[PDB]
Design an enzyme around this catalytic site. Sequence first.
Site, PDB file in Angstrom:
ATOM      1  N   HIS A  12       0.770  -1.247   0.000  1.00 49.33           N
ATOM      2  CA  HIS A  12       0.000   0.000   0.000  1.00 49.33           C
ATOM      3  C   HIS A  12       0.793   1.285   0.000  1.00 49.33           C
ATOM      4  O   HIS A  12       0.210   2.349  -0.171  1.00 49.33           O
ATOM      5  CB  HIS A  12      -1.005   0.026   1.159  1.00 49.33           C
ATOM      6  CG  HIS A  12      -1.992  -1.089   1.105  1.00 49.33           C
ATOM      7  ND1 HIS A  12      -2.964  -1.180   0.131  1.00 49.33           N
ATOM      8  CD2 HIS A  12      -2.175  -2.152   1.924  1.00 49.33           C
ATOM      9  CE1 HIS A  12      -3.684  -2.271   0.335  1.00 49.33           C
ATOM     10  NE2 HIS A  12      -3.213  -2.888   1.406  1.00 49.33           N
ATOM     11  N   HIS A 119      -3.457  -2.675   7.638  1.00 50.55           N
ATOM     12  CA  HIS A 119      -4.539  -2.999   6.681  1.00 50.55           C
ATOM     13  C   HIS A 119      -5.061  -1.704   6.106  1.00 50.55           C
ATOM     14  O   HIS A 119      -5.197  -0.699   6.818  1.00 50.55           O
ATOM     15  CB  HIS A 119      -5.631  -3.756   7.442  1.00 50.55           C
ATOM     16  CG  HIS A 119      -6.973  -3.741   6.801  1.00 50.55           C
ATOM     17  ND1 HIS A 119      -7.326  -4.613   5.797  1.00 50.55           N
ATOM     18  CD2 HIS A 119      -8.078  -3.000   7.074  1.00 50.55           C
ATOM     19  CE1 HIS A 119      -8.577  -4.373   5.439  1.00 50.55           C
ATOM     20  NE2 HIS A 119      -9.058  -3.410   6.209  1.00 50.55           N
ATOM     21  N   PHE A 120      -5.280  -1.703   4.800  1.00 51.90           N
ATOM     22  CA  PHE A 120      -5.944  -0.606   4.156  1.00 51.90           C
ATOM     23  C   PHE A 120      -7.431  -0.918   4.061  1.00 51.90           C
ATOM     24  O   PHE A 120      -7.834  -1.874   3.394  1.00 51.90           O
ATOM     25  CB  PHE A 120      -5.365  -0.350   2.759  1.00 51.90           C
ATOM     26  CG  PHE A 120      -5.791   0.956   2.183  1.00 51.90           C
ATOM     27  CD1 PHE A 120      -4.985   2.095   2.294  1.00 51.90           C
ATOM     28  CD2 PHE A 120      -7.018   1.057   1.527  1.00 51.90           C
ATOM     29  CE1 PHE A 120      -5.421   3.325   1.782  1.00 51.90           C
ATOM     30  CE2 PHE A 120      -7.450   2.295   1.010  1.00 51.90           C
ATOM     31  CZ  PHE A 120      -6.628   3.416   1.134  1.00 51.90           C
ATOM     32  N   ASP A 121      -8.269  -0.103   4.711  1.00 55.11           N
ATOM     33  CA  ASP A 121      -9.706  -0.395   4.758  1.00 55.11           C
ATOM     34  C   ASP A 121     -10.524   0.260   3.655  1.00 55.11           C
ATOM     35  O   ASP A 121     -11.378  -0.405   3.054  1.00 55.11           O
ATOM     36  CB  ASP A 121     -10.271  -0.046   6.141  1.00 55.11           C
ATOM     37  CG  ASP A 121     -11.486  -0.876   6.508  1.00 55.11           C
ATOM     38  OD1 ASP A 121     -11.413  -2.118   6.392  1.00 55.11           O
ATOM     39  OD2 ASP A 121     -12.511  -0.293   6.918  1.00 55.11           O
TER      40      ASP A 121
HETATM   41  O1  LIG Z   1     -10.219   0.862  -1.148  1.00 53.18           O
HETATM   42  C1  LIG Z   1      -9.696  -0.261  -0.970  1.00 53.18           C
HETATM   43  C2  LIG Z   1     -10.471  -1.359  -0.596  1.00 53.18           C
HETATM   44  C3  LIG Z   1      -9.826  -2.578  -0.415  1.00 53.18           C
HETATM   45  N1  LIG Z   1      -8.494  -2.680  -0.591  1.00 53.18           N
HETATM   46  C4  LIG Z   1      -7.783  -3.936  -0.428  1.00 53.18           C
HETATM   47  O2  LIG Z   1      -8.640  -5.032  -0.758  1.00 53.18           O
HETATM   48  C5  LIG Z   1      -8.550  -6.024   0.272  1.00 53.18           C
HETATM   49  C6  LIG Z   1      -9.848  -6.811   0.409  1.00 53.18           C
HETATM   50  O3  LIG Z   1     -10.904  -5.861   0.366  1.00 53.18           O
HETATM   51  P1  LIG Z   1     -12.443  -6.265   0.601  1.00 53.18           P
HETATM   52  O4  LIG Z   1     -12.832  -7.032  -0.646  1.00 53.18           O
HETATM   53  O5  LIG Z   1     -12.444  -7.090   1.873  1.00 53.18           O
HETATM   54  O6  LIG Z   1     -13.105  -4.911   0.703  1.00 53.18           O
HETATM   55  C7  LIG Z   1      -8.226  -5.210   1.513  1.00 53.18           C
HETATM   56  O7  LIG Z   1      -7.648  -5.997   2.557  1.00 53.18           O
HETATM   57  C8  LIG Z   1      -7.300  -4.139   0.988  1.00 53.18           C
HETATM   58  O8  LIG Z   1      -5.964  -4.639   0.849  1.00 53.18           O
HETATM   59  C9  LIG Z   1      -7.745  -1.566  -0.972  1.00 53.18           C
HETATM   60  O9  LIG Z   1      -6.515  -1.663  -1.119  1.00 53.18           O
HETATM   61  N2  LIG Z   1      -8.366  -0.403  -1.154  1.00 53.18           N
HETATM   62  O1  LIG Z   2     -10.504  -4.326   9.893  1.00 58.32           O
HETATM   63  C1  LIG Z   2      -9.408  -4.908   9.975  1.00 58.32           C
HETATM   64  C2  LIG Z   2      -9.024  -5.794   8.967  1.00 58.32           C
HETATM   65  C3  LIG Z   2      -7.790  -6.415   9.057  1.00 58.32           C
HETATM   66  N1  LIG Z   2      -7.007  -6.169  10.132  1.00 58.32           N
HETATM   67  C4  LIG Z   2      -5.692  -6.805  10.246  1.00 58.32           C
HETATM   68  O2  LIG Z   2      -4.909  -6.362   9.142  1.00 58.32           O
HETATM   69  C5  LIG Z   2      -3.953  -7.364   8.765  1.00 58.32           C
HETATM   70  C6  LIG Z   2      -3.984  -7.597   7.256  1.00 58.32           C
HETATM   71  O3  LIG Z   2      -5.308  -7.974   6.855  1.00 58.32           O
HETATM   72  P1  LIG Z   2      -5.809  -7.859   5.327  1.00 58.32           P
HETATM   73  O4  LIG Z   2      -5.717  -6.386   4.941  1.00 58.32           O
HETATM   74  O5  LIG Z   2      -4.878  -8.746   4.523  1.00 58.32           O
HETATM   75  O6  LIG Z   2      -7.212  -8.393   5.426  1.00 58.32           O
HETATM   76  C7  LIG Z   2      -4.297  -8.611   9.574  1.00 58.32           C
HETATM   77  O7  LIG Z   2      -3.315  -8.777  10.608  1.00 58.32           O
HETATM   78  C8  LIG Z   2      -5.673  -8.322  10.139  1.00 58.32           C
HETATM   79  O8  LIG Z   2      -5.865  -8.959  11.400  1.00 58.32           O
HETATM   80  C9  LIG Z   2      -7.423  -5.264  11.138  1.00 58.32           C
HETATM   81  O9  LIG Z   2      -6.685  -5.025  12.124  1.00 58.32           O
HETATM   82  N2  LIG Z   2      -8.621  -4.652  11.029  1.00 58.32           N
END
Ligand SMILES: O=c1ccn([C@@H]2O[C@H](COP(=O)(O)O)[C@@H](O)[C@H]2O)c(=O)[nH]1
Ligand SMILES: O=c1ccn([C@@H]2O[C@H](COP(=O)(O)O)[C@@H](O)[C@H]2O)c(=O)[nH]1
EC number: 4.6.1.18
Length: 124
Positions: A12, A119-121
């Site tokens: 990211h 994590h990017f949300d």
């Molecule tokens: O605006 C966004 C939304 C999602 N993600 C990436 O897509 C993954 C799965 O997204 P989702 O399908 O759970 O929303 C996230 O963990 C994040 O790495 C992004 O990079 N940018």
């Molecule tokens: O809302 C979230 C979603 C993911 N994670 C953490 O972010 C990391 C990467 O997750 P993802 O972006 O691959 O889902 C993991 O350690 C997961 O537990 C969070 O803390 N909050």
Amino acid sequence: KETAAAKFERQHMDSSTSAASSSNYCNQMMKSRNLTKDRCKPVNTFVHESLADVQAVCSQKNVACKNGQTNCYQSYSTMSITDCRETGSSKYPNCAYKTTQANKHIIVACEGNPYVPVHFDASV
Ligand SMILES: O=c1ccn([C@@H]2O[C@H](COP(=O)(O)O)[C@@H](O)[C@H]2O)c(=O)[nH]1
Ligand SMILES: O=c1ccn([C@@H]2O[C@H](COP(=O)(O)O)[C@@H](O)[C@H]2O)c(=O)[nH]1
């Protein structure tokens, strides 16, 4: 092994350009950051700000995460970002992406000590 923090940086962070992102930016960036190695990652955002500035978001506006967790933080300022979204005709391993530059507030989840983005949300 790669820490959750380091993985966030790989997936990211792109501090090197202000926005540039040629129409080809996502095609290249998604491959090299190893986001296309096993499958084409569907959606992924890169942030064009300093690491310290993105790390600072962990002490900014606490907001609910999409999955209901409470550890998300929204940047007070807009940030330069590029969204990469896999095209309809993209076929693994030839992963193809539409590149979209924007200036938006980012929302990241933070964890650990030090308390850093993992994590990017979302962007808003
Ligand atoms: O605006 C966004 C939304 C999602 N993600 C990436 O897509 C993954 C799965 O997204 P989702 O399908 O759970 O929303 C996230 O963990 C994040 O790495 C992004 O990079 N940018
Ligand atoms: O809302 C979230 C979603 C993911 N994670 C953490 O972010 C990391 C990467 O997750 P993802 O972006 O691959 O889902 C993991 O350690 C997961 O537990 C969070 O803390 N909050």
